[model samples]
Each structure stands twice: as C-alpha cells, then as structure tokens.
Target: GSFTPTKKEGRCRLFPHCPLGRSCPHAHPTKVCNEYPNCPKPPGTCEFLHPNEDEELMKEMERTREEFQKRKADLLAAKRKPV
Candidate 1:
C-alpha cells in the first residue's frame, strides 16, 4: 500500500542504516507504511546511505495516486464513448 513517485530516483544522503531507528518517532505502520516492515521493499527502494528513500518515495506515490486517479477517471469516461 505504501507508494512513492518522486520525479527523481536520484541519490540522497540520509542513510544506509536504520531508517525507523534514526527517527524513533517513525513508529506505527499504516498502509502507507507498508515499506516499514512485514511487507517486501519494492525496486528502487534502497540506497547506499539515504534510507529516507523509501519514505520519500511513499510520499511521492501518494501524490501520484491522486493525479493518476483523476486521469484514470477521465480515461474511463472516454472509454464509455464506445457507446
């Protein structure tokens, strides 16, 4: 459920260590926390030092979802034109 869609998969400088541990407040896993634990970390999801990568990605993904949802709605409506 955790999603991210940053325009940049570029390198950052936050980790390669305990992402959650660093900011002890990074507690409680939600659907957006799927990358937290218990779930598999997806591709482009790791870094040599910036552990915030996944977290940031999840954040971006949220935005992407909103935009894509609108796009999908439009596409779906247009497809109904097949009527």
Candidate 2:
C-alpha cells in the first residue's frame, strides 16, 4: 500500500519553482538538493533530499495506484455482493 506522510518527508519542486504555492500537496523540503543546478543522477534515483524534477510524475503514479486499488476493491465487493 502507498502511504502519504502527514509531514513533508520528501521535498518536491515544480520545474523552476513550485506551482501549487502554499496549497502544494507534496512536501516542501527545507533542505536544498546537494546536486542542484547539475544533478548527475537520474531524476528519481537520487537518494539525498532535493527538489525532485519528477515530483509531479511521482504524484501521478500515486494517483494511478490509488485508482487501481479503488477499482480492485469495487470489483471484489461486487463479486461478494452477488454471491
């Protein structure tokens, strides 16, 4: 199961800056990326805290997973209800 923390664990960024501003759903990390400007590692492969370029993509992945789980539950319930 995917668990979203109540506190900002991973820092997220929106391209040049955060688009969501104060309402940003992701965690706004106070810690700057050590590899900022030129991070050699892949987008999501980096372990250290930093404003991830693939933040939005990660969120999308979470959303897709959640949708899948919801659908799976619905189908399972439907089958049990019919039995």
Candidate 3:
C-alpha cells in the first residue's frame, strides 16, 4: 500500500524528492512509481515540479487534525461499548 504522486504541479516538489521509492515502507499509493526499475529508485532521487500554497497546506493540516481527533473519539467510544 503506497501513495505515489500521479499528478504533480507547483508546490508539490516534495513528491519526487522521496529517496526510498517503492522500497519505502511508507510509500504513498498516490505517489507510488508506476515505472518499473525506475519505480524502485531511492527517495529524493527524482524531483517533481510542485508549488503548493501555504494557506492550502495549512487548511489540509487542520482537516487532518480534526479527522484524527474524530477517529480517536470513535475508537474510545467503541472501546467502552461491550462486545
């Protein structure tokens, strides 16, 4: 289960900056390499042209935080419930 960057644009240069490539345990499916041989390349070897807006990044971060909290609450509620 990897996340490879399929479509890269401005502010997303970090996508190709990965050095671990497919070998990386944390490979993203969206950012996974489709090309063989090249797919197994190390992280940070290839660089993409992506330029993301700071505001957009911040919003995404906030969303992730909220989602994390929601999931945590759900887990706690499930744990308290009897089987």
**Between the candidate structures 1 and 2, which one is better when assessed by TM-score?**
2
For model 1, what is the C-alpha lDDT against the true structure?
Answer: 0.45
Which parts of model 1 are misplaced by more than 4 Å?
A: 1-45, 48-56, 81-83
Better of 2 and 3 by TM-score: 2
Clashes of 1: 7
Descending-TM-score candidate ranking: 2, 3, 1
- Candidate 2: Cα lDDT at 75: 93
Tens digits of lDDT, candidate 3, 1-83: 65987753222333324556556544233332346343333333322211231334345545767988888888878849523
Question: Candidate 3, which segments miss by more than 4 Å at Cα?
Answer: 1-52, 81-83
- Which candidate number has the best TM-score? 2
Name the TM-score of candidate 1: 0.32
Runs of candidate 2 with Cα error greater than 4 angstroms are: 1-38, 41-51, 81-83
* Candidate 1: RMSD to truth: 14.9
Model 1: per-residue lDDT, tens digit, 3-82?
67745443333322224544543222223443344434443433321235456655654676788888888887883842
lDDT score, candidate 3, position 80: 96
For each candidate, the alpha-carbon lDDT, in order, equals 0.45, 0.57, 0.44
Which candidate order results from sorting by lDDT in descending order? 2, 1, 3
RMSD of 3: 12.9
Candidate 2: 10-residue stretch with minimal lDDT: 8-17
Candidate 1 vs candidate 3: the lDDT winner is 1
